[PDB]
Amino acid sequence: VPTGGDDPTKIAMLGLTFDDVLLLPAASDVLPANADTSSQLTKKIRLKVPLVSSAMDTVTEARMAIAMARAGGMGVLHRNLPVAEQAAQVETVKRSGGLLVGAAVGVGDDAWERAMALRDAGVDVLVVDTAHAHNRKVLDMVHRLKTTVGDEIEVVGGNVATRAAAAALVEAGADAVKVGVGPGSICTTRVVAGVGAPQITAILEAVAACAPHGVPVIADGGLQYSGDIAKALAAGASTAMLGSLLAGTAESPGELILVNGKQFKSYRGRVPFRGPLSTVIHQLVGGLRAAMGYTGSATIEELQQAQFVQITAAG
C-alpha cells in the first residue's frame, strides 16, 4: 500500500468536506425565484424550506422553533433542561398556530419519560439525539419509539457518518437519518478523540443506504455558508441542520456580547450577531435558489442529482 502497511482497507476512503467540492453548472430552464425549495424532513413530513435548527441550548428554544416554522423550516428543541420544561416549550410552540416542532431525546434513564411527555405535549418529530447512533441502545430506542408512537410522531435517529450505521437506523425504523460525526464543529471531536468523517463523503455514504429505502438524510454539522447547504443537498441530503449559522440570530437563546466594538452571541465560543432569523434564512435560501438556477434543478429532488467538481487547496 502506497501509504503504508499491507492492508488496502486500513485507509478505507478519501473523505471530502464541503470546501473540497463545487457544484457544476448544467443546462437550466430554472430561474432562482421559481425553484421549489420544499423537501422531505422525514418520510411523511415535507418542509417549505429544507432547513432545521440544531437541538442545542445556544440555538433552539421556543422562540427559535416558532421563527423557524414560520420561515418554512423547523426547530428541534434541545434537551438540556428538565422534562417538564422542554414539554412546556413544545406546548408554547403549538399554541402559536399550526406549527411543526421537533424535540431531542437521548437514550439515558429519563429519555423514555421525556419522550412520552413530549408526545403528550403534541410534538411532531422526536429526534433520538446521540453522538454515535451505531449502537444497540440507540437503535433499540428508535425502534421502540417507532413501534409505540410511530403512527402519530416521526422518529429521527442520529448521528452517523457511515453507510453501515445509516443502514442500521433504517432497519430499526428511522423516519430520517441524521449525518454528522466529527463533521468539523465546535465540539472538535476530531481533535479530542481523533474521530470524524468529512461531510460530503459521509452524506454520500449515508444516502447510499437511505435513499433506496425512501428515508431522508439530514446533513448535520460543518455548514458554514449558504453554498454549503446547496452542496449538502446535492450530495443527496434532503435537509440541513444548522447550529453555528443560526446561533447569532436574535431568536436564539442568550444575550448580546460586545467585544472590541463588535456584537456577538454565545455558541457552545462565540459567533457574530446576525440580526433576525428571517434575514439569515432569506440569505441562505437565496444562495440555495441561485444554486438551483445554475444546476437546472427545479426541485430539491433534482438538485440531489447534480454533479460536483473536486477542487484543490489552491482553488
Ligand X SMILES: O=P(O)(O)OC[C@H]1O[C@@H](n2cnc3c(Cl)[nH+]cnc32)[C@H](O)[C@@H]1O
Are 302 and 296 in contact, with CB atoms under 8 Å apart?
yes
Are 127 and 102 in contact, with CB atoms under 8 Å apart?
yes
Q: Which of 83, 88, 186, 187 is catalytic?
A: 187
Measuring CA to CA, which residue among 280, 147, 303, 301 is closest to residue 225?
Answer: 280
Closer to ligand X at the Cβ: 63 or 78?
78
List the single partner that 187 binds among a copy of itself, ligand X, none, CB under 5 to 8 Å by kind: ligand X
Q: Is 162 in the site for ligand X (CB under 6 A)?
A: no
Q: Is 54 in the site for ligand X (CB under 6 A)?
A: yes
Measuring CA to CA, which residue among 265, 285, 267, 284 is closest to residue 275?
Answer: 265
Q: Is 180 in the site for ligand X (CB under 6 A)?
A: yes
List the single partner that 96 binds among ligand X, a copy of itself, none, CB under 5 to 8 Å by kind: none
* Sheet (strand 270-272) strand order: 257-259, 262-266, 270-272
Q: Is 197 in the site for a copy of itself (CB under 8 A)?
A: yes
CA distances from 96 to 65, 66, 91, 192, 280 (A): 10, 7, 9, 41, 22
Q: Residue 240 and residue 272: Cα distance in Å, rounded?
A: 21
Q: Is 202 in the site for a copy of itself (CB under 8 A)?
A: yes
Closer to a copy of itself at the Cβ: 44 or 224?
224
Q: Residue 267 and residue 248: Cα distance in Å, rounded?
A: 8
**Amino acid found at 174:** A
Considering only residues 213 to 252 of the shown chain, the ones binding ligand X according to CB under 6 A are: 220-223, 241-245
List the single partner that 196 binds among ligand X, a copy of itself, none, CB under 5 to 8 Å by kind: a copy of itself
Are 133 and 139 in contact, with CB atoms under 8 Å apart?
yes
Q: Which stretch binds a copy of itself (CB under 8 A): 87-95, 111-119, 177-185, 265-273?
A: 177-185
Q: Is 210 a catalytic residue?
A: no
Interface residue with a copy of itself among 23, 237, 271, 281 (CB under 8 A) is 23
Q: Residue 289 and residue 42: Cα distance in Å, rounded?
A: 22
Q: Residue 123 and residue 153: Cα distance in Å, rounded?
A: 7
Closer to ligand X at the Cβ: 191 or 256?
191
List the single partner that 293 binds among a copy of itself, ligand X, none, CB under 5 to 8 Å by kind: a copy of itself
Q: Is 282 in the site for a copy of itself (CB under 8 A)?
A: no
DSSP secondary-structure letter at 175?
A: S
List the single partner that 191 binds among a copy of itself, ligand X, none, CB under 5 to 8 Å by kind: a copy of itself
Active site residues: 187
List residues near ligand X by CB under 6 A.
54, 159, 180, 183, 185-187, 189, 220-223, 241-245
Residue ranges for the known binding site for IMP are 185, 220-222, 243-244, 267-268
